[PDB]
Design a binder for these strands. Sequence first.
DNA 1: CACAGTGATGCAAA
DNA 2: CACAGTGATACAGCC
DNA 3: TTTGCATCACTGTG
DNA 4: GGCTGTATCACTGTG
Lengths: 548, 547, 344, 345, 68
Amino acid sequence: GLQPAVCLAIRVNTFLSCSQYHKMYRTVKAITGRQIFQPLHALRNAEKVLLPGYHPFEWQPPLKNVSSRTDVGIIDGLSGLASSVDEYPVDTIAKRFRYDSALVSALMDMEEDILEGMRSQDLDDYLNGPFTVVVKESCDGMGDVSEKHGSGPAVPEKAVRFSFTVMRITIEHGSQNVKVFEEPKPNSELCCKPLCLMLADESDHETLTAILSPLIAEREAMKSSELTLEMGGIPRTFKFIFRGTGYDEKLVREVEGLEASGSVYICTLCDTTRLEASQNLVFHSITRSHAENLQRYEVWRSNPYHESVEELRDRVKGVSAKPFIETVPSIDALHCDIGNAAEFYKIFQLEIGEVYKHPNASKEERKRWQATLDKHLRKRMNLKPIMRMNGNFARKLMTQETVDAVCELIPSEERHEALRELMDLYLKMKPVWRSSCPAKECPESLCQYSFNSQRFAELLSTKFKYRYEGKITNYFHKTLAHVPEIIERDGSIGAWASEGNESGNKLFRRFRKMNARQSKCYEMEDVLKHHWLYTSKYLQKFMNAHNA
Amino acid sequence: GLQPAVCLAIRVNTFLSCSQYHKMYRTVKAITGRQIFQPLHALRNAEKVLLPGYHPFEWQPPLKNVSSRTDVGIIDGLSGLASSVDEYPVDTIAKRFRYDSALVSALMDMEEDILEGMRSQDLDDYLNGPFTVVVKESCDGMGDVSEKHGSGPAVPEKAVRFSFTVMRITIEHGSQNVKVFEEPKPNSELCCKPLCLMLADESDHETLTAILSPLIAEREAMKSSELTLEMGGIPRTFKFIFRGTGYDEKLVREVEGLEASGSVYICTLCDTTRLEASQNLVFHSITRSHAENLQRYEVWRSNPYHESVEELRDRVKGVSAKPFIETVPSIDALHCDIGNAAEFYKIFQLEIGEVYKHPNASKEERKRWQATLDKHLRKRMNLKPIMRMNGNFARKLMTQETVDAVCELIPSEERHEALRELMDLYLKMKPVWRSSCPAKECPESLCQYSFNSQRFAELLSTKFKYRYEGKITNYFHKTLAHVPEIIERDGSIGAWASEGNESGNKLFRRFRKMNARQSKCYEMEDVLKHHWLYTSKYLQKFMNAHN
Amino acid sequence: MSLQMVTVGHNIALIQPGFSLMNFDGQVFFFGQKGWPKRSCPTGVFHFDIKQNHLKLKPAIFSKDSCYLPPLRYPATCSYKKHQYIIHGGKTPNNELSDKIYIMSVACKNNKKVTFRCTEKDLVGDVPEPRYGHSIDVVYSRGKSMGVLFGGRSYMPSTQRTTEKWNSVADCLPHVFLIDFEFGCATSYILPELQDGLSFHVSIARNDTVYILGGHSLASNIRPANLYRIRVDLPLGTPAVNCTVLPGGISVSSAILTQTNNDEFVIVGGYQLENQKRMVCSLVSLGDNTIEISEMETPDWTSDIKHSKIWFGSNMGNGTIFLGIPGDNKQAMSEAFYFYTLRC
Amino acid sequence: MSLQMVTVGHNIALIQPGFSLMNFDGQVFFFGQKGWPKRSCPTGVFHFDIKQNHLKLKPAIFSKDSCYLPPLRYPATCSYKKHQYIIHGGKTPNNELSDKIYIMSVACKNNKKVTFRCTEKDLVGDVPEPRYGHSIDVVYSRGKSMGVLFGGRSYMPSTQRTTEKWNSVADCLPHVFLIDFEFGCATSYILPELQDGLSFHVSIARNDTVYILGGHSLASNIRPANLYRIRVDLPLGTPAVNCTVLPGGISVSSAILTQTNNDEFVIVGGYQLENQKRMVCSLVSLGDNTIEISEMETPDWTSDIKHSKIWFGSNMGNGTIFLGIPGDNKQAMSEAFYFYTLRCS
Amino acid sequence: ESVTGYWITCCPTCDVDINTWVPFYSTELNKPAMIYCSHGDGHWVHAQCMDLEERTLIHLSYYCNEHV
DNA sequence: CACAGTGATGCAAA
DNA sequence: CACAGTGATACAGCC
DNA sequence: TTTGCATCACTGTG
DNA sequence: GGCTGTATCACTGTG
Ligand SMILES: [Ca+2]
Ligand SMILES: [Ca+2]
Ligand SMILES: [Zn+2]
Ligand SMILES: [Zn+2]
Ligand SMILES: [Zn+2]
Ligand SMILES: [Zn+2]
């Protein structure tokens, strides 16, 4: 005996396609003689409960511009966009859920953990007090996604994924809010529920807006409302406080209405010129918001003070487009680490070439330096040369042994000491913006942060002025300035990182190849459904049922 | 209670990694209370009798320069190549089986198949006659294989795969030979048993020969010998016939010592030049052979007649290297089809712009013609532009619907009939060299092949003389001239193709990142072992236990 | 009609379907690019310069007293006469309709340089709802100049809009709007002769009449061959508008109109059916009170144009039409269009 | 001594470790490319022209009587005075040893083009076994000229070679070989002072003596610091060969030799240990009966050389050594090796 | 890339990075454009690193910042 | 005439 | 301080 | 009522 | 005494 739910959990979690599962079931049944595994149709029937559009729910007050039906599943991402010849050409296949249905399905799946945590917090398991659900949104733009032969629109070779993850649930049982659930691994791919999958270029602003507008409309509609849902008997009420902090820097620039990623304004958190950032490096403040960006765009369009182009650009600091997604200003840990690793790699390249003294940069010497650095790194730290910069190279490059090996190629000893001190300061600052709870895991490092940042800035301005005099990278500016304020505001930076969505990209790329139909009108639907089934805690609980 | 062999077969053929199988077994045991699935160590113990190097065997006479041990498994592909600083740099990691042990294992895993084949033709199961087995050899060079971080050799981003597939076994009863076994899917990826995996560039002659020399020496030793094995409790004697046919044109030119890439001499079977092939187009023969190439290289090196460079190359017929692998002269069906499809694509591009009427054209105009063809090939045939042509694109482009769709772009209806006739002739010729048994499958198309070839050549020389007057592509020459005879000699063309090795490349890519340790000193051996297990008929036949 | 190919430089990606071409003193200007303005040309208006069959797009800087307008995608554009371009409606890159009137003129022209002035005007009265794909013309009568605006496409009203069909469109009401730019007042008239809405039609501006030909009714999914004549009388009191249906019309949608000669127009392009393009060109001869439409010679279309699925374009104001064909071959390639120029 | 970088054209891939450089009346030639000869240069020999620190490898055309020799990766090469070069042994691109002697001379020289004549000579008598990395020199005594060949590395004998260790390399016997080129004969001599085989050593050819320094014995995996003098006398009868050990030797393997001035040589490059490169250069001063080994000033090496794992090179014969470092990485082909020229005064 | 790999540090203050490169001038379709200088042996440097304008780059299409 | 998938749908069988 | 693998080996523990 | 297998328009390795 | 379960090693891939 083996239940259909358990069979589905095994099949989904152990990366088995339907054909492979059918072969396994057929062989087991034929050889043993008893039906250990349930049939594929039974599994498909049993997989409908977990998917969206099955449980009844109510919204009080009723959602504005959103239908009241509670039986809607996978729907077309175009949202009825006109495909007529006369109108704007449409070359994009997209599939998405409804946001409210996805949230209600996620809450129904998490029901068991919610009740278990409520019991563990010494609270009676029948309260209907208004909860508070925190969901982090992520939007990522992939590349090198090959198109398929067949009839249909000439879709591009890049995809866009929009997903959400439930981070925290709190309930009021007095003068304080008690937490009943918290994700143990926020960046794990096992908790990143896809919501929309489209095949369109990230920089294709028109198509991106046309596809993603309904989701933003739903999110704005249900920011101020309550959701009543029957959970474990009693109906209970939930509230939602969305927090989108998973986008990368370029996508934040594109959706927040800011200018191109290369300009005189180089921060999505504050409004500071590159020269001012380079000359200050320490003291700033967070003074940017979605409503402020909307007002800035309105000022830019209306030109109320009748100013020229330069004066107008100074007045509206970088905003030249109307924002359409409300993103909380945040620092992405993964991309910050990647950028810092690339910066330190270039710093090592310069240092091993004696730029401070006798900087006779030769067209051949500039490549000799890179070649010798790459060979030395391969021989000592076992790192191969890579064109781009990824996370593992960053982690293996920021280690102290990397600087110890690089110092063998620098003739001077003062440069050795300066580089070692800089690397030590960076490594002391890193665990503050990467941990899931800085106030409890690295309290000394969290407290001793302003002094370390000031020393880092002073060293970078004194002993490395040959590169940073009127020029500081955006990630360096963010790390030096807005780490403590953002930690105080949110609680932990890194728990809201984009690692979950990046791993969901890998899961998407695997499923599109070996877990879905190969047609052009069904691949996105099948991939979305299988991904949602994969990120189900009810199914994942069986795989860990061995130990209790 | 599933047996360990059954569990191993399920895990191997369902593409389940060891960790995933462990999770499934743990969950099933915990939630059922009975050990339905056998554990990982039981599976590993049960898989031992399947890898090469378990069964005893004998060689009579003993193989020259080959050890007599019968317990050698995965060995180092470098074959003890010197790795000191003074010696030539070594930048490759390779793992290989011994050829004799691999063939012993391959013959042993099909004991039930051999017995069933013998019973199917009314022969005693205790026969000890000399089984003559023909083994097809394939070698491919892949590209874009990512290097891994670590310490050791700086391996390049390319790999080379060597594989063999047992084709058929014949037993001599009375005075006639009868086929005990015959592969029903010769090009299938399920019979592509690997022998040597390495990470080196295909066009790296020094490393390629330094790695592949032991295998060729083993094959030469095994060519004149016989193998005594035990099957069903009876001793049996086996003789081997090796046929190397999976090589592509570039690899066969590089190995057989011919001049690389395109040159004056274009075919690997005859001695014709490009101009002679373009002038005749219908009549040739087969004269190339390994011994002939060796003699040609010796003549080239010695220069007995004291001739200049031009005369010496004319006398040597394009041989400028010493061959080291005996590759049977043949045509690869997959690459022949791909090349012919590319040539027809180019012909469509030229005929769209009416080159036959306009002698010259500009680069922008040619690009516009190509863009028009690519755009129009999507509305009607549902295709997309591809940088390099592939098999599915070829099979879709060679249909009559494609010429019907491109017909409505040629302004003149005079060219429509010529293009349609050319396509019809190509489609008549294709099944002859694509079938696995032309004589018993398409006798009508096989009998009338010379007439179709002559009509095709006349059409090319009369209508399409603006591209094929003085220059005919090598694959077109092979198809038109060298094919009515390879069918008579060997028996089929598509059977001896590189499709199996090309499909096994996909399994190699999957296993490298899903069923192998992530390290620079274990990945090759893990991939080799898992591929050999995946290509085991004893494990395969359990999955078809229902029928 | 002469057909030539024009090679576009490094600003090719800036040309997307639905753009607008303005004619100022013999010069051609381009508006309605793809995406929000970059830092090279923050204004959003370009100097469409075509010479020896080569196209260049140079930035143009607005004046200090101008409003930087967003990039529209299907505005209703009309000329006005001391020469102005009045644009209404359109779609911003964020896929939201705009209901603002922009008047664009020239402040000062330097040596091969032109500075524009853009002024936003707010309408009062029965203001037209946000829409795109409509037509606006200017009518002069008895010394008074007004504007006539017809219907187009629009999103569903906020009281009937659902996120499952957020991007769905519907034809606006067939009412006729009369706009006075002197005080910016709009009055709506419902004419019994107009019952089914139209979109992507052709409007011709005579002395005191506006002629409407072509269209695509969304509700019935047809392309009626109905010709309408809207006549506006402008006495000292309230204006009067009368609509008359006339025979001899043609069926076309999203066609391109050019003015080769006085009392004469040329219609090129369109879509007779969903996929059957209108390869024929029409000649419209206008009189003081009578009009006629005839069929002219079909130009020698190239191979790519005859087999293209969609085509767009605009009028350069000098008897020429600038029209494009999608490349449909983009393997990380910048060249995605095959622009051509046609001369009548 | 000064070090200067040199850039190669579009055929840099033709340069591989072990390449031989030949000198003919001030002209530099390159032999031993990578892979079999292509259509551009069927002969396999190239003109190595350096102009304003830029390297060009031009094609060369053999004569009518030439024998087109296969590329050799580690041949033993010596000069002989019509000036000619004698090449013995080596490894062919098919990774098999050769046992043939090639004599290369200049037939006719025109403007910016040279024609070579290659002749194959077959040895008789106790023919030396195929080997690579050995040293052959030319000795003139009492008006008669012969050649002295020392041992190197070879494969296992054909009756003791197993396919599991096919590419295993073993040192050859320390027997010395005397070769006569007028009649192409050979004779082997066994000496008591030589008991362990040596490979990748340095040979100096004086009037009637051959000096052997350095080496690498694979049997013991050591690099002895031994200096041997081989004196060959050519009377009317059979030749007499004696060997003598001399204190003052150095330990080096695969070292590069150059001749700067008369009765003076310079040793640059080589390996002292497996993971260490001999960064010091040595000066050898010849004499009537004694030689002097001294240490010269260390050249200002670049940062890439001092921290590289291997390096190779050859001698141009004009006091300039052409050396190379396997720089960059195996990636998109933007330089695979880095080539320097060292001028020793 | 071919033989024109633009990913090389133009100057000590070379702000160009492969990970975060963005088109500043309206001419870099997929890869940044580089300006060649004939001072000494000559060298290719990124256009953005020179702090030039779009019009200046168009006019150009030499001594670099450290060579003037 | 490459071949083993690939998942949902639908009709036939016990 | 990303995280779920990737397989072979060795050793503690239980029926 | 629950199982089982055929069918459709595609894939990837070239 | 023999089968079972789990820690450990140096790496991966999506960025
Ligand atoms: Ca990304
Ligand atoms: Ca291949
Ligand atoms: Zn900031
Ligand atoms: Zn031939
Ligand atoms: Zn730069
Ligand atoms: Zn310069």
